[PDB]
Amino acid sequence: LYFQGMIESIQELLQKEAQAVLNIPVTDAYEKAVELIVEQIHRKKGKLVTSGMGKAGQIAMNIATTFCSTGIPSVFLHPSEAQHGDLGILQENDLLLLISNSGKTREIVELTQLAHNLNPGLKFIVITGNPDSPLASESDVCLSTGHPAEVCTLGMTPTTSTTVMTVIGDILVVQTMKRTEFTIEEYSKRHHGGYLGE
Amino acid sequence: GMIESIQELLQKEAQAVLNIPVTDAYEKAVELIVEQIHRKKGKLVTSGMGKAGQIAMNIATTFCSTGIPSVFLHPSEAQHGDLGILQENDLLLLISNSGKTREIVELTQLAHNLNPGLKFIVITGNPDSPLASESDVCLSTGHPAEVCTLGMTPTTSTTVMTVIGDILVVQTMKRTEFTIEEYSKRHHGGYL
Amino acid sequence: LYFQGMIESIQELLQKEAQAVLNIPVTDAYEKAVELIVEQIHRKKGKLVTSGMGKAGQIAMNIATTFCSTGIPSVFLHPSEAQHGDLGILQENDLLLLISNSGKTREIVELTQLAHNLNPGLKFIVITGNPDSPLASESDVCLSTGHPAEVCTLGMTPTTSTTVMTVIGDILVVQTMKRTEFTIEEYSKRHHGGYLGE
Amino acid sequence: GMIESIQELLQKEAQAVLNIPVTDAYEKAVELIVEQIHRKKGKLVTSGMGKAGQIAMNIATTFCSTGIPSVFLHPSEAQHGDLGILQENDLLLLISNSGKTREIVELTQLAHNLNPGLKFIVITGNPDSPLASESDVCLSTGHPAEVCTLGMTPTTSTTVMTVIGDILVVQTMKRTEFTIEEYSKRHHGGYL
Ligand SMILES: Nc1ccn([C@@H]2O[C@H](COP(=O)(O)O[C@@]3(C(=O)O)C[C@@H](O)[C@@H](O)[C@@H]([C@H](O)CO)O3)[C@@H](O)[C@H]2O)c(=O)n1
Ligand SMILES: Nc1ccn([C@@H]2O[C@H](COP(=O)(O)O[C@@]3(C(=O)O)C[C@@H](O)[C@@H](O)[C@@H]([C@H](O)CO)O3)[C@@H](O)[C@H]2O)c(=O)n1
Ligand SMILES: Nc1ccn([C@@H]2O[C@H](COP(=O)(O)O[C@@]3(C(=O)O)C[C@@H](O)[C@@H](O)[C@@H]([C@H](O)CO)O3)[C@@H](O)[C@H]2O)c(=O)n1
Ligand SMILES: Nc1ccn([C@@H]2O[C@H](COP(=O)(O)O[C@@]3(C(=O)O)C[C@@H](O)[C@@H](O)[C@@H]([C@H](O)CO)O3)[C@@H](O)[C@H]2O)c(=O)n1
C-alpha cells in the first residue's frame, strides 16, 4: 500500500550518503597521516604509492591522481600485479597508502609482506572499515570510514563505503596541500591550459 | 586546528551531496540502463578523463557487481581502435565536469559515426554545455565548490559523481530485482 | 680477453628473439581458435574477454585492443579484479582468451573456476609456455609459445616469451580478419581521421 | 591453407625483428637509464597511445621486474594532473610509431615546461619526425610492413617495439649487475 516515487527514494539515498560523510571519524590520525605524507614525499622526495582491490582500488587510483595534481608525486600499485614484478616501482623514502574495507584483503596483506621484505623501513597508512583488523593494527596510521551501511538493496555493494573513502582522499589532499603551500603556478604546470582558462 | 578544519570539509562535502539536483532525469537514465542492458543485453560503456574518468571506472565495476555488464572505455584510447569494443544495444555513460572535455566530445562524434542509434547519459557540472545538450539524459552534479585550497582540484565534484553512480546502481538493481545469489556468483567466496 | 661490444650483443639478442618467433608451433589449434572467435564474436555477437597477470597480462591487454581495432569486440578482464565484481562484465556468448606462461597462474585458475560457476557454457583459449599444464589441459584450445629461453641475463624475466605471445596475438587477429573480411571502411570507423590520412 | 599462411606471418615478423637497426643509440639510451635511474635514483616514465602505449606499459613492468623503477604515464591523463607523478632525475621513454602522436607531442611540451632538464628516449617508426628530432635518443623500429590484411593494424610494429623494450632491459641489467636475489625480492615465491 506504500508506493514510493523514484525522486523520494533518491532523496533518501542522498541523506544516507551525506550522513555517512558527516559521520567520518576525525581524530589526530589525520594529522599523523598528513605529517607522514609531507615528510616522506614533500621533504624526503619519495612518492606516495596507493593500492586496493575492486572499487576500493579504484578510489586508491583516484587518490594517487589527486595527489599528483596537487604536487605530491603518487602512483597506484596494483597489489596482485606487485607480485609479478611491479613491486620494483618502489624507491627509497616512498610511503604506502592502502585501502581495504575489510582490513584483510588477500592481495593487500600479501603486498604488505612483500613490500616489507623489500624495504622494511616502508610505512603505511590504511583506510579501512575495520580498525580492529590485521592491516589496521599493523599500519603506521589507521584512518577509519566509520563503517556506514551500504545503500545497496542487499546491503553489500560498496557505495557509501566508497563515497566515504573518496572523501578521506580529499581530506588527505587538502590538508597536505595546505602544509606544502601548493600554488596556482604549480597547479598550472600539471594541467593543460584549459584548466587556467587559456 | 586540523580537526576543526576537517570537520568543515565534511560539512562541505555532505552539503554537496545533499544538493545533488533530483529530477525525472534519474528515472529516465535508469529506464535506459534497464532497457539497453537488462532487456536488450547490451553493456554499459562508461567514460571520462582524469579523476572523473576514475569515477567512471568505479561505476562500471559497481554495475558489473550488480548484474549490469559494464566496461570503461578510455576516450582517448577509443580513437586508436578501442572504439571497436562497442556492440549493438550498448549504452554510453559519459562523465565530463566541464561538459566539453576534448576526448569525450571526440568520443561522442566517433561513436555516433560508428552507430548512430547509440544513446548517452552524461554526468556533468554544466547542464548548459554541448555534451549536456546533445545527451539523451543529463544528470547534473549541482556544481559544488571544490574544497581544494585553490578551488581547482576535483574533490566535492568527484564525491558527487561517485554518489550519482551509487544512485544509478541502486535504482537499477531495484528494478532488475538483483539477488544475493547473483551477487555471490560475481565475487569470491569471502563476500558471502 | 673476449670483449663484446653492445652492438654485437644486441645483434645476438635480435637473432634469439627472431628465432623464438620462427619456432612458434603452428598446428590446427590456430584454426580451431579462429573458428571459436568467429563463431562466438562475429556470428553470435559475443565479445572476446582476455586476461593474464604481469607482463603476460599486458600482452592480453594489447590483444583485446587489436581485436577491437579489427572488428572483434574485446575487453581485458583483470583476473584478480574479476573476483571483486568485474566478473559481471561477462555476457552470453562471450569467449575467454587466457594467457599464462606457466599454465597455472593463481588468479587465472581462480578466474576459470569463477567464470565456469557463472556460465558453464563459456569456452576458453589458453596461450601458454606449458601445454601439459592444468590450464592447457582444461582449455578448449591450447596455443603453445614453444617455450623459448628468455634473453634475461638471469633467464627469468619475460622477454622472448612475451614477444612470442604478442605474435600469437597478431596471428589470431590477422587470421580472424581474413575470415570476417574486415574492411578499410570498418577500420576507419574505429580510429581517428589521421589513420586514413584525413 | 591456414598453416602455410601463419608460417608466412612468422617469417615476416621474425624478419622485422632481424631488421631492427642497431646503432650507438642503444648504448646512449642504456647509459641514460643507468645514469638517471640506477645512479641518480629517478624512475623511468614510459608513455604511448593505443597498442603502442600497451607496449610502453609492458616495458615499465619489465624494468620494475629488473630493478629499474618505472611507471607508465598515460599521455592524455598527464594533462589532467597525472603529470605530477614526475620527480627530479626522472627519464621519459616515449613510444610513437608516427613520431607525431598528438598526446605524446603534448606530453613532451608539458613535461618540458614542468622540468626543462627532463630527457627523453623515443621509440618510433619515423626517425625524421618532430618527436624523433627533438629526442635525446631515437630508437627506430625500421618501420616494417604490418601483417594486417589491410596493412594498417599494429602487429609487426608492436612486436618490434616489445623487442626494443627487451633489449633496453637486458642491456641495462647487464650494466647494473642485477642479481637473482633482487629479482626474487620483486616477485612472489613461485618465481624462485
Ligand atoms: N581473509 C578474508 C578476506 C576477506 N573476507 C571477506 O571478503 C569480502 C571482500 O573483502 P575484500 O576481499 O577485503 O575486498 C574488498 C575490501 O577491500 O574489503 C574490496 C573492495 O573493493 C570492496 O569490494 C570491499 C567490500 O566493501 C566488502 O568489504 O571488499 C568481505 O566481506 C570480507 O570480510 C574474508 O572473509 N576473509
Ligand atoms: N573546450 C574546453 C574544454 C575544457 N576547458 C576547461 O578545461 C578545464 C578542464 O576540463 P576538462 O578538460 O573537460 O577535464 C575535466 C572535466 O571532466 O571537466 C576532467 C576531470 O577529471 C576534472 O579534472 C575536471 C575538473 O573538475 C575541471 O572541470 O576537468 C576546465 O576548467 C574547462 O572549463 C575549456 O576551457 N575548453
Ligand atoms: N601454482 C603455481 C603457480 C606458479 N608457479 C610458478 O610461479 C612463477 C610465476 O608464474 P605465474 O604466477 O603463473 O605468473 C606468470 C605466468 O603467466 O606464468 C605471469 C607472467 O606475466 C610472467 O611473469 C610469467 C613468467 O614468465 C614465469 O612463468 O609468470 C613460475 O615460475 C611458475 O612456475 C608455481 O610454482 N606454482
Ligand atoms: N599529427 C598527426 C598525428 C598522426 N597522424 C596519423 O595518424 C595515424 C595514427 O598515428 P598516432 O595517432 O600517432 O597513433 C599511433 C602511433 O603511435 O603512431 C598509436 C599506435 O598505438 C598505433 O595505433 C599507431 C599506428 O601504428 C599508426 O602509426 O598509431 C598515423 O597514420 C599517423 O601518420 C597524422 O596524420 N597527423
Distance CA A159, CA D68 (A): 38
Amino acid identity, residue C144? S
Whether B130 and B101 have beta carbons less than 8 Å apart is answered as no
- Rounded to the nearest angstrom, the minimum Cα separation between B121 and chain C is 19
Find the D133 Cα to ligand 4 centroid distance in Å: 17
Query: Which residues make beta-bridge pairs with B120?
Result: B92
Distance of CA D135 to the CA centre of its chain: 13
Q: Determine whether A19 is exposed, middle or buried from the number of CB atoms within 10 Å of its CB (0-12, 13-18, 19+).
A: middle
Touching B (3+ Cβ pairs <8 A), the chains are A, C, D
D50 close to ligand 4 (CB < 6 Angstrom): yes
- CB-CB neighbours of A43 under 10 Å: 11
Dihedral, CA of residue D10, residue D13, residue D19 and residue D23, to nearest 10: -130
Nearest CA in chain D to A195: D80
Say yes or no for a CB contact (<8 Å) between A80 and C53. Answer: yes
Whether C38 and C180 have beta carbons less than 8 Å apart is answered as yes
Distance of CA A97 to the CA centre of its chain: 6
- Which DSSP letter does residue C149 get? P
Q: Determine whether C22 is exposed, middle or buried from the number of CB atoms within 10 Å of its CB (0-12, 13-18, 19+).
A: middle
Say yes or no for a CB contact (<8 Å) between B150 and A174. Answer: no
Nearest CA to ligand 3 atom 31: D191
Q: 3-class secondary structure for B10-32?
A: HHHHHHHHHCCCCCCHHHHHHHH
Q: Name residues contacting ligand 3 (CB within 6 A).
A: A 84; C 53-57, 100-102, 104-106, 158, 161; D 190-191
Distance CA A195, CA D110 (A): 13
Distance of CA B14 to the CA centre of its chain: 19
Residue C176, CB-side half-sphere exposure with 13 Å CA sphere = 29
A161 close to ligand 1 (CB < 6 Angstrom): yes
Distance CA D168, CA D94 (A): 13
Size of chain B, expressed as the number of residues it contains = 192
Under DSSP, is residue A74 helix (H, G, I), strand (E, B) or coil? strand
| Interface mutation target, options C62, C66, C77, C86, chain B, most CBs of B under 10 Å | C86
- CB-CB neighbours of B163 under 10 Å: 29
Using only C-alpha atoms, what is the Rg of chain C? 18
Q: Is D76 left (phi over 0), alpha (psi -120 to 50) or beta?
A: alpha
| DSSP track, D130-179 | HHHHHSSEEEE---PPP-STTS-SSSHHHHHHHHHHHHHHHHHHHHHT--
| Technique used by the depositors | X-ray
- Rounded to the nearest angstrom, the minimum Cα separation between D58 and chain A is 10
Nearest CA to ligand 3 atom 33: C102
Q: Report the run of H or E that residue C175 belongs to, with start and end.
A: helix C160-180
**Which of B61, B84, B110 faces C68 most closely, judged by CB atoms?**
B84
Phi, psi of B171 (to 5 degrees): -70, -35
Mutate to test the pocket of ligand 1, among A76, A102, A135, A156 (most ligand atoms within 8 A of CB): A102
- CB-CB neighbours of B116 under 10 Å: 7
Distance CA D56, CA D93 (A): 8
The sign of the dihedral angle between the CA atoms of D63, D66, D68, D69 is positive
Amino acid identity, residue A60? A
Whether B169 and B59 have beta carbons less than 8 Å apart is answered as yes
Nearest CA in chain A to C86: A54
Under DSSP, is residue C162 helix (H, G, I), strand (E, B) or coil? helix
Distance CA D92, CA D73 (A): 9
Take residue A102 and report the three cell numbers written for it. Answer: 575489510
Domains of chain B and any CATH numbers:
1-192 (3.40.50.10490)
- CB-CB neighbors (< 8 A) of A118 in chain D: 185-186
Say yes or no for a CB contact (<8 Å) between A85 and D77. Answer: no
Spell out the residues 6+ positions from residue A121 whose beta carbon is closer than 8 angstroms to its own.
none
Nearest CA to ligand 4 atom 1: D100
| Interface mutation target, options B187, B191, B192, chain C, most CBs of C under 10 Å | B187
- CB-CB neighbors (< 8 A) of B71 in chain C: 75, 89
Find the A184 Cα to ligand 2 centroid distance in Å: 16
- CB-CB neighbours of D171 under 10 Å: 22
Whether A118 and A90 have beta carbons less than 8 Å apart is answered as yes
Find the C51 Cα to ligand 3 centroid distance in Å: 14
**Ligand 1 atom with the shortest distance to the CA of B188:** 7
Distance CA B112, CA B86 (A): 11
Distance CA A78, CA A98 (A): 11
Find the B189 Cα to ligand 1 centroid distance in Å: 10
The sign of the dihedral angle between the CA atoms of C108, C112, C114, C119 is positive
Q: Which ligand gives the minimal distance to the CA of D153? A: 4
| Interface mutation target, options B3, B4, B10, B172, chain A, most CBs of A under 10 Å | B10
**Ligand 4 atom with the shortest distance to the CA of C194:** 7
Say yes or no for a CB contact (<8 Å) between A53 and C107. Answer: no
- CB-CB neighbors (< 8 A) of D74 in chain B: 74, 76
- CB-CB neighbors (< 8 A) of A154 in chain C: none
- Which DSSP letter does residue B190 get? G
Size of chain D, expressed as the number of residues it contains = 192
Take residue A16 and report the three cell numbers written for it. Answer: 544516507
- Nearest 5 degrees, angle CA A153-CA A156-CA A158? 105
Nearest CA to ligand 2 atom 34: A194
Can you point out the beta strands (E) in chain D? Answer: 44-48, 70-72, 91-95, 119-124, 137-140
Using only C-alpha atoms, what is the Rg of chain A? 18
Find the distance separating the first CA and the last CA of chain A, reported in whole Å. 57
Which residue's entry shows cell 589525520? A30
Find the B187 Cα to ligand 1 centroid distance in Å: 10
Distance of CA B34 to the CA centre of its chain: 15
- CB-CB neighbors (< 8 A) of C28 in chain D: 3
**Which of D80, D103, D153 faces B50 most closely, judged by CB atoms?**
D80
Find the C101 Cα to ligand 3 centroid distance in Å: 6
Q: In what order do the strands lie in the sheet with C74-76?
A: C74-76, C48-51, C95-99, C123-128, C141-144
C194 close to ligand 4 (CB < 6 Angstrom): yes
Which residue's entry shows cell 567514460? B47
Phi, psi of A108 (to 5 degrees): -80, -40
Q: Determine whether A195 is exposed, middle or buried from the number of CB atoms within 10 Å of its CB (0-12, 13-18, 19+).
A: middle
- CB-CB neighbours of A185 under 10 Å: 8
Distance of CA B171 to the CA centre of its chain: 14
Say yes or no for a CB contact (<8 Å) between B149 and A58. Answer: no
- CB-CB neighbors (< 8 A) of B114 in chain C: 189-190
